[PDB]
Design a binder for this molecule. Structure first.
Ligand SMILES: Cc1cc2nc3c(=O)[nH]c(=O)nc-3n(C[C@H](O)[C@H](O)[C@@H](O)COP(=O)(O)OP(=O)(O)OC[C@H]3O[C@@H](n4cnc5c(N)ncnc54)[C@H](O)[C@@H]3O)c2cc1C
Ligand code: HEM
Ligand code: HEM
Ligand code: HEM
Ligand code: HEM
Ligand SMILES: O=C(O)/C=C/C(=O)O
Ligand code: NA
Length: 568
């Protein structure tokens, strides 16, 4: 067969997959996937037949109900979504190499003669709020607005939900939570505020950070009330105390949080449309939003009439060309992001009249696994790992900010460093088992062996750990002044993860006020237009603190959802 449909049509009718009229049920291909499931079983059940020791196409960390058509198209060869970050040994029938080729919003100007057509038609739907983007902000905003009584349509341009949010690992910052107090941590919203302002070099908009710190405990409560487990509280860089909340044992905060929001959305029957890209915010003749034109991958262009559009589209850290224009030093770097985190949501906010701010501050995460091409959480260092260079020496306060950590690693020989930890660190953070599973955490029972495996002087490495452990014992890092020394690295085996900075987060984005309203260049609110999450600028100034983005998208998404419901 040349394609999956052709393969099946040797012994099946078209309506084995299609509706009776043959029309695609919708852009999520809900009906069609239901047919794949009716014969092949759920994803879990498919997974059983495709196990590999350390990976499985059908049993991934992606939350929500991942459609089969996310990777298996019927009438054309299709791409494996995991190939956008990994290079696992897959043999998907009818596959084609991963290649993201999505027109920019500007390029879709080529469809004027179909967009105009769409805009002249009746709206496909009429609701109160359209939320664009199914990351943490979008889901929060959809839920929020629905809880407030608004009818929402939540759209997602990828075949899968979660954006970058589902990849999040280290934690969601919040101060003065019950979760913290359960752990004997003392903190305060003013402390979180102060950490964030200095972490962002005082570029941050103070009123936005006030929302961020003051709403954080509320955001953690809200999530917890929805089913989230944010009881593990870890240390992230640039933080005075542990406040990065995450699931018990130190599991990824992101997949979990997005999973909860998704289940909550499903429970509220929120209309969630996959393969549906927001293209252009529609304004009436008085300049308030009147809807949004979207491009359904299978239904084409259509618009939704709504009083409020909440842009929750994430950042542009995967778009290296845009990143390079704003920060020429990040050009050619690998990104930790999902494939569609390319800034099309900012273009949509900009075409609507939203002004942008702080675009030039683009965060590189210091520790992208060299081997794996994926983010290794800062929580690894927060929980006690150290960084060592090829020379086998520490060279930086590993819990400093992402900007200082990146520059320090890039100044090491080979422009990469090694996270070094033991079984005590491993065991304190379950997320580290995911890296051992990826094959990116080589291990050995001695640092000499470990260094010889990775090309780190073993004897230097061994002295470095012994030196580090002493400092942990004495309670002060006089070498690099790492202010939190949670654990000696002397339990069980030792592990090394080769790391180098990757593009990660765009701290710049659409200008919003404390009600998450998008402002134009003359600082005027554009009625009905809201922005939440990484698509906004001003929250994190020049350097976002680890944990603050997940705090931010829940806080701002919830807030946008409420404000929009209310605005109506
Ligand atoms: C690998 C990784 C791990 C991270 N770990 C952490 C962590 O522990 N703690 C932390 O604080 N931060 C962490 N971060 C940062 C944080 O996850 C992100 O900032 C991300 O969650 C921002 O959330 P968001 O809702 O704004 O956008 P995202 O979650 O990126 O979601 C936005 C959605 O919008 C969709 N979209 C975009 N444009 C359009 C359009 N025009 N139409 C329709 N849909 C559109 C995108 O496809 C995407 O799904 C991590 C980021 C990465 C990449
Ligand atoms: C878009 C929807 C579907 C997807 C993504 C899908 C997935 C797949 C794939 C990847 C294969 C292997 C093809 C090959 O080896 O060349 C396959 C085969 C098969 N499919 Fe599907 N399928 C879908 C719908 C269906 C439906 C509706 C039925 C039955 C009515 C079905 C029954 C089968 C059978 C019987 C086989 C051969 C092997 C087997 O499962 O015993 N599939 N399918
Ligand atoms: C000869 C038999 C079939 C015919 C004539 C047919 C017809 C079509 C048409 C016209 C479309 C595009 C609809 C649009 O763009 O609006 C489509 C898409 C689609 N069809 Fe089929 N179909 C057939 C069999 C199947 C089978 C056997 C499957 C799955 C095993 C399937 C699954 C799908 C899916 C998932 C889509 C969305 C796009 C894609 O993945 O290619 N169809 N089909
Ligand atoms: C219930 C949802 C899905 C169904 C029914 C389906 C169906 C299938 C089937 C029948 C096979 C052939 C494996 C075998 O049985 O020999 C397969 C293989 C495969 N599918 Fe799916 N699939 C689904 C979802 C997905 C998703 C979401 C992705 C990517 C994340 C994916 C990517 C692949 C890959 C990469 C292979 C080859 C497995 C390997 O080489 O280990 N599938 N799928
Ligand atoms: C269905 C699609 C995918 C599959 C099956 C998959 C598979 C895996 C596997 C097997 C691991 C090792 C730990 C574990 O077992 O979870 C892993 C880790 C990881 N993957 Fe994926 N991957 C997929 C897609 C992606 C994509 C598209 C990205 C980036 C956008 C990504 C980012 C990561 C990261 C950052 C890690 C490190 C551990 C963590 O944060 O949990 N994965 N993935
Ligand atoms: O877990 C991490 O390393 C990333 C955190 C962040 O980007 O906030
Ligand atoms: Na931003």
């Amino acid at each position: 067969a040349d394609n999956l449909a052709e393969f099946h049509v040797q012994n099946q009718e078209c309506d084995s997959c299609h509706t009776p009229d043959g029309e695609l049920s919708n852009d999520s291909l809900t009906y069609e996937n239901t047919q794949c499931v009716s014969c092949h079983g759920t994803l879990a059940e498919v997974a059983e037949t495709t196990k590999h020791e350390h990976y499985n196409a059908h049993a991934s960390h992606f939350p929500g109900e991942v459609a089969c058509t996310s990777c298996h198209s019927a009438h054309e060869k299709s791409m494996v979504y995991c190939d956008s970050c990994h290079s696992f040994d897959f043999n998907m029938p009818y596959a084609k190499k991963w290649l993201r080729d999505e027109p920019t919003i500007a390029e879709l100007a080529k469809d004027k003669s179909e967009r105009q057509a769409a805009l002249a038609s009746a709206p496909h739907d009429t609701v109160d709020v359209v939320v664009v983007g199914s990351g943490g902000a979008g889901f929060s905003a959809a839920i929020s607005a629905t809880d407030s009584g608004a009818k929402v349509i939540l759209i997602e341009k990828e075949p899968v939900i979660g954006g970058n949010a589902k990849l999040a690992a280290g934690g969601m910052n919040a101060a003065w939570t019950d979760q913290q107090k359960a752990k004997k941590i003392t903190d305060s919203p003013e402390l979180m505020f102060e950490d964030t302002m200095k972490g962002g070099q005082n570029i941050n908009d103070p009123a936005l950070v006030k929302v961020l710190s003051s709403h954080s405990k509320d955001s953690v409560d809200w999530m917890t009330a929805m089913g989230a487990d944010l009881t593990d509280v870890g240390m992230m860089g640039g933080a005075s105390v542990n406040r990065a909340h995450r699931p018990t044992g130190g599991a990824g905060v992101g997949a979990h949080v997005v999973q909860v929001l998704y289940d909550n959305a499903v429970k509220r029957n929120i209309d969630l449309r996959m393969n549906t890209r927001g293209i252009e915010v529609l304004k009436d003749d008085k300049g308030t939003v009147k809807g949004i034109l979207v491009k359904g991958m299978y239904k084409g262009y259509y618009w939704v009439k709504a009083d409020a559009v909440i842009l929750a589209t994430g950042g542009f850290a995967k778009n290296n060309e845009r990143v390079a224009k704003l920060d020429p030093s990040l050009k050619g770097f690998i990104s930790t992001n999902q494939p569609g985190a390319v800034g099309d949501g900012l273009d949509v906010a900009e075409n609507a009249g939203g002004a942008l701010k702080d675009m030039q501050y683009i965060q590189a995460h210091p520790t992208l696994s060299v081997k794996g091409g994926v983010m290794v959480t800062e929580a690894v260092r927060g929980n006690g790992a150290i960084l060592v260079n090829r020379e086998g020496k520490r060279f930086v306060n590993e819990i400093t900010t992402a900007d200082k950590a990146s520059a320090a690693i890039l100044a090491q020989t080979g422009k990469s460093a090694y996270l070094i930890f033991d079984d005590s660190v491993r065991k304190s953070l379950s997320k580290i088992d995911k890296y051992i599973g990826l094959g990116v955490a080589p291990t050995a029972d001695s640092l000499v062996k470990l260094g010889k495996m990775e090309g780190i002087d073993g004897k230097a490495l061994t002295e470095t750990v012994a030196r580090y452990n002493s400092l942990v014992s004495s309670g002060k890092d006089t070498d690099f002044e790492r202010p939190n020394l949670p654990r000696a690295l002397n339990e069980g085996n030792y592990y090394a993860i080769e790391v180098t900075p990757g593009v990660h987060h765009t701290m710049g984005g659409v200008m919003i006020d404390t009600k998450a309203e998008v402002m134009n260049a003359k600082k005027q609110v554009i009625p009905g237009l809201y922005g939440a999450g990484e698509v906004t600028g001003g929250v994190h100034g020049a350097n976002r603190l680890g944990g603050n983005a997940i705090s931010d998208i829940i806080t701002f998404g919830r807030l946008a959802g409420e404000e929009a419901a209310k605005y109506s």
